[PDB]
Design a protein. Sequence first.
Lengths: 311, 305, 324, 325
Amino acid sequence: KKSIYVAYTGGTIGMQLALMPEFHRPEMPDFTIHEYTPLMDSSDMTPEDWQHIAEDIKAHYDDYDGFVILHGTDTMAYTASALSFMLENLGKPVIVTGSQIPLAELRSDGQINLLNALYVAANYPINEVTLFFNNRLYRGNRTTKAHADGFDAFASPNLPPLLEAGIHIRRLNTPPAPHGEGELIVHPITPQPIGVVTIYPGISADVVRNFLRQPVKALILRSYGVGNAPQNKAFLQELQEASDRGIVVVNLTQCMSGKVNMALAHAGVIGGADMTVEATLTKLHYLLSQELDTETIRKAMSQNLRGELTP
Amino acid sequence: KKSIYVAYTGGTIGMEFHRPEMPDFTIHEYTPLMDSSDMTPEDWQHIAEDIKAHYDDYDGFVILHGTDTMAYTASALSFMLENLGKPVIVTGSQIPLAELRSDGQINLLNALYVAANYPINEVTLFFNNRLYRGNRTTKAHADGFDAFASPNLPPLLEAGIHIRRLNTPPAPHGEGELIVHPITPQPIGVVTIYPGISADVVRNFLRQPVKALILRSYGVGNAPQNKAFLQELQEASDRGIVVVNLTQCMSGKVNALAHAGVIGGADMTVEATLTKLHYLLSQELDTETIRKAMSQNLRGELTPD
Amino acid sequence: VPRGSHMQKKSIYVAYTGGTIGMQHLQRQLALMPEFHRPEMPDFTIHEYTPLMDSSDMTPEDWQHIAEDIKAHYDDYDGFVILHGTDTMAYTASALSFMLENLGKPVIVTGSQIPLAELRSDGQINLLNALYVAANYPINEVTLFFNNRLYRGNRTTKAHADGFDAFASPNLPPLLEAGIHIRRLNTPPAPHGEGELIVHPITPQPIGVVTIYPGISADVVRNFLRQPVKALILRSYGVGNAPQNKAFLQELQEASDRGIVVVNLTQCMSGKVNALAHAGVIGGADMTVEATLTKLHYLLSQELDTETIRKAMSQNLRGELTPD
Amino acid sequence: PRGSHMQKKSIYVAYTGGTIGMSGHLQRQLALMPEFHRPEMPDFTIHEYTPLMDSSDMTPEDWQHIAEDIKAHYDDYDGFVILHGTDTMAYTASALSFMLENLGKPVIVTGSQIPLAELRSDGQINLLNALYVAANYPINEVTLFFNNRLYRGNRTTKAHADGFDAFASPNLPPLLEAGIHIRRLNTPPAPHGEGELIVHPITPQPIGVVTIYPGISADVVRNFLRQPVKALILRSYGVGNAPQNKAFLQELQEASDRGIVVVNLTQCMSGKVNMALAHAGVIGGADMTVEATLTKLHYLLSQELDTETIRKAMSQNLRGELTPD
Ligand SMILES: NC(=O)C[C@H](N)C(=O)O
Ligand SMILES: NC(=O)C[C@H](N)C(=O)O
Ligand SMILES: NC(=O)C[C@H](N)C(=O)O
Ligand SMILES: NC(=O)C[C@H](N)C(=O)O
Ligand SMILES: [Cl-]
Ligand SMILES: [Cl-]
Ligand SMILES: [Cl-]
Ligand SMILES: [Cl-]
Ligand SMILES: [Cl-]
Ligand SMILES: [Cl-]
Ligand SMILES: [Cl-]
Ligand SMILES: [Cl-]
Ligand SMILES: [Cl-]
Ligand SMILES: [Cl-]
């Protein structure tokens, strides 16, 4: 019989398991729930909350066959993405899930997403940080909350799911992530000021100038299509002035799906390929927190570290 | 036999047509031709005034446009055109008409044919066999022929062996003389909510007099409750800045921030919200009238409660 | 979809006909699940059929049995949930739409891909949603609830044998979608009568279902004509195309001349049927096989001449087809 | 595979008929369309069939005609596009996959929902893409190209009679998707032999296609047992269920007794049969389409094999048409 650790970090799902007979069925793994203190709305999470969860998995790693992280949907994809970088040589499944309706409210999805995450962690283990939602397991660092009001809340726009649940559970033929074998390594992080700039008609040089001020180590650009911005010379020079001061400037697509393929490149900007804002932001927290020079971080942002981008 | 006007504004498309089932059409090549990534809000104005000049002498309008900001233009034209009595269809291509496997020919042919034969008196975006309400569109798929989505509204029309109008609820629609609303430059900020965002971002925009702030918030419109954040946002509204709360999510409806003077943008796209703000800021309306108008369905861009 | 008052506590009748949901006791499982008993949920009464059936073993007589059950309890409840096996859920939902006229209360067919007894069951959530919908969104048609969508019954088929999304409505959007909120879609209404519920009964009808496939001969239509048939459904290619060889077209004209109702459908999941006409074949527009088979059982069970049935097959009686 | 672009390829186009051409009209239309003659496009040769056929009128003999045409021209060209009516495109693609052993060159079936000669035709783009894919992405399978996707032929059905997205592959992802770039998908390969192309004959075989539906009688299986059956395809419910009626199960057991190959499929668009009918001699068709199962039976019944060998072969993945357990 497998044993699954459940980190109950907060979220809708919690806003009871004993009174439901399905959970204690013989076919289920054993599981234990740790209720965090305090419980958090995932809208209130900081990057240090990613650290608390990573260290909680680290404490429990040896004594469980897998890990379920119960979490608010608002930032679930950021947490999943962060854990993927912070965990290295992961040898057990870590599945983040939650609910769009609280377990306490009628028609809650919370019971069914938790039961599925527990069953899948035990019986179809995949040694990656994954996100289970509405009968699909996704690579955590490929996810976004796409549908604010839907039970199918999460998408994986640039990658098929890893696993689908119907009458049976099927592992899909999705290409595996680069995967280290060895001792689990858990990478701590420390606060990093990062700006997120959306490219839109009538954006000014002033925005890039503002972030440069004193307080930012990296800039994420949400640019058009395959990575275009207006060719405004003030804008470009601001971006060059950013990279000249060692700021890591990364070009993403504002589009739900697709790949940046770039100039901005002349202005020191690094392409983020098909990375989500969630993967890019967390990967920056990860790399900035390490003993790495600006140029090594700039190189690593465009490489596939944990399956978050297509080379 | 219908006559369709084609504004060739630029874009990928330019970097069977004359056979008898087709409408007559005329192409106006803009000077200069523009990559849509280079568009400013004054380019929306130039297109609206071009449609105004040609309105009386054509049965419909096709706007040829780069894909990068097609949804922004479509969205802007929907506000700027009032009491529209003929179809305005924005389209283009993911591959240049000049490159192999181009979608340009089939998107243009379709847009001309639909403008002539299935007119809908709205600013629409035709792409990959679907017609969408312009102010509901986003470029969702950077690399795909199905480049555009309408996440919170079904398409108005779909083309197969036959073309059918779908049963999509009609937009609020004025009858009367076409009114074309000019716009003038408006400084507007777009803030994405994410873990570890600082009050300084809102402090920065408050100090470089922006007239409006769009928040891309979590889920149904949540942000972290950090008192410094909420305070800077309140300071912005105190100074008369229009702060509108949208979902960063592809689909759904926004539902403390309110206490801080922030307005709910319901299920509006960033494209709709930004262009609506250009439109309303450009008219001579109180901040309070602008704040109430942002949450009202002016042209079919949002789903009322 | 009407948004019905929640003011008073509703009473829903549950016809537990059989199906996966109750296999391994249903009533005891539901007694033990607190969500079913909350103040926001309607009161409900379960009639367990004797015997319980695997929906694979259902005959038209079972359609008749369920319609009589609804008629018997119609004045006494606010709505009806038919718990049913998935395998023929779409044929039952299609048959009820034709057999019930002047329907002034919801009838919702639902079930599960996995038994309530088994692990990872969809039965709890499909039945909870059906009950809640029947109470609060009382659409006066026979509908099918599965996987957070309410569908027009006579537009459904089981499209996904292994999926929790088992049912599709290929030629009509859903009536309603469930998320954080329950959203009514603006799908236009079916024809509606007025007054007390009328059940149009059925009696056995021999009906053949021919698939058109390359190498099918005129001896197939001759074989169906050979003893047991009053109607032939053709699952034709694309928009209603069949071999145009004279033997095949003669065989069909001979069938129609003997008063066999021949109906041309697409074998395709979606689309609309647009020679065969001159051979007496009637176009079934965008109808499913489930809608067409059940419509024929309804129409053939009435004292109608062949011409009247032919005409009625191409007409939208209950929302099952899209008129030109 | 992403094939080399170094030498100008030569693609043979079998113009069998279909919506695309509705003599000399196709070939003249393509002459007049500059897209087709650019440097980046392969050279191509059109063989226009006489007569051209509506795909609705196709029989197994037509599958054989097309297979002989490919074999006759195999060494002379780098690849084959089969231009075909949509109505039975999926039956032809499925039949070729079984008939063509040691296939070392792409064969791509395509066509159009709207004639090249009409307005808003999809024929231009489906055929241009097919040619360009055959030359540059030379997958050694019978494939079907429609609406920017390349599918495994023996996994397809015409799902959408009115849509430009007419074809689906309900149980297998596409092999390739076309956008700004051409993306190859992770889809695992079919079994492949080695050496010269071998064409297995497919002949006429009396095969019945039974839809299971409430009220179906034993008389249907008795009817088919009259003559037109060496094989019977059951379109059963869900994961392969049928009524438990003793007479029904008797007639099926009787058929398998008389050497009739009885194969159980789902009537559902997607999913997999899971097998009683097994005790009645019925063979499970796993997740095969009717198109793959009809053509597989034509193939095996026309081969030098006994009833037992055909029954075993029907549940085996021969060409990528079936997902093994
Ligand atoms: N999660 C995401 O990154 C989706 C999209 N690329 C965006 O810019 O929001
Ligand atoms: N077009 C859009 O607005 C999509 C999504 N709401 C975003 O914030 O990018
Ligand atoms: N339910 C259906 O009718 C689907 C499809 N038209 C078929 O012939 O099976
Ligand atoms: N192509 C197919 O076989 C689809 C579906 N299984 C049918 O029975 O028609
Ligand atoms: Cl949503
Ligand atoms: Cl690793
Ligand atoms: Cl102007
Ligand atoms: Cl894309
Ligand atoms: Cl208006
Ligand atoms: Cl109630
Ligand atoms: Cl070539
Ligand atoms: Cl269709
Ligand atoms: Cl050899
Ligand atoms: Cl399935």
